[PDB]
Symmetry: D2
């Protein structure tokens, strides 16, 4: 399950798998995807994790709001880093692998 | 509150403000920051928005988990895009502004 | 040659092909890859496109320097944008296609 | 010249300075900007570093072509990585500094 390209890593991420690069050397890091959802207008007022300016703007829309899926990283520090992005090096790399489990 | 550089936009984003580029022409788009949080190990099992493989891995850690703040975009489509990233063009741009409210 | 995923776009980019997303609507934009090269230490002093601080640092290395391949965009404005990066939306998109030629 | 925010790092990069994060621990890495240029249509055929499909497309334009400035990284491996991008962590970090020289 190794020597994968970025595209293969991405297809595994969309399947809820965890992936990593060999070149990230034994630091326990991996990437994963968090699913999207559509939040009903009725539910939206209960969301804690939006700035008030944004929450007000969206409630004024008075409609259900779609939140997109996105990639996240479990860092060398053991934090969940929201919104992981692929460097040029990562996108072109041939050393990706799928973590077991 | 216009003709700002990316750095100024970023400092406004950390203040929970919404920011945008003039060069994004009247499509209603803006960037905002979602706050970080530390989730107690006791709370973590209740999280819906993590893949099961990741949720299991983290619960096995048996510790509180930090989730980082991250930038998000309200898109031209009216979706909340999690994990917005700055293109070269955005990082070097001098046409940022802070949205009122 | 359509309805491609990002991974397929990336494999085409590594083949020197030009690729684009349907969702970028008829603005003539495409992505391409610029090749890497290793520049001999003897050649390096002739490079115009490096800041002097960086050029001095590298010449002091007194060794050949590898420059990585990277993705670039031909923009809606008709500029070559060096160092194009894939948004969350792009990485997860299923509407990529290879441009003819 | 330390404890800088990303915006301050970016303003230094536009001045042709080299910048880095404390959290990148003594691996010699830094970021720098490569200048943009406008290449005359007459010069463009001589460019080695463009795929043939792209070079042909641009020459058919029969006009001068602008190439944008972009950020680059001198990596832990000692390679010049073209098209460096700022992670969420980097954009929000308060540990940037300007390298001397
Ligand atoms: N700062 C921070 N806190 C986090 C993070 N992940 C989880 N939490 C906290 O855990 C609570 C429950 O998360 P949930 O079960 O996914 O429950 C979430 C989830 O089901 C949904 N939701 C909110 N935003 C999104 C989103 O962007 N995508 C998806 N798919 N669902 C979302 O709304 C529910 C309630 O959201 P909240 O009120 O924010 O309530 C969240 C928030 O307080 C994170 O990355 N950062
Ligand atoms: N600002 C700017 N100018 C551009 C750009 N593309 C081409 N040029 C200009 O065109 C000259 C010739 O480019 P080349 O044929 O690729 O000739 C290049 C190429 O063969 C090589 N080289 C330099 N940097 C790189 C790199 O990052 N990657 C690769 N593969 N080759 C490089 O060194 C040769 C001489 O480089 P320069 O002295 O810089 O000379 C460059 C530079 O003045 C661009 O995106 N931005």
């Amino acid at each position: 399950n190794r020597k994968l390209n970025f595209g293969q890593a991405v297809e595994a991420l969309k399947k809820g798998k965890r992936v990593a690069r060999q070149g990230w050397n034994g630091k326990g890091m991996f990437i994963f995807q968090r699913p999207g959802d559509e939040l009903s207008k009725t539910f939206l007022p209960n969301v804690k994790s939006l700035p008030d300016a944004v929450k007000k703007f969206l409630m004024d829309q008075d409609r259900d709001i779609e939140f997109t899926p996105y990639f996240c990283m479990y860092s060398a520090s053991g934090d969940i880093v929201n919104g992981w992005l692929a460097s040029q090096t990562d996108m072109q790399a041939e050393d990706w692998f799928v973590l077991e489990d």
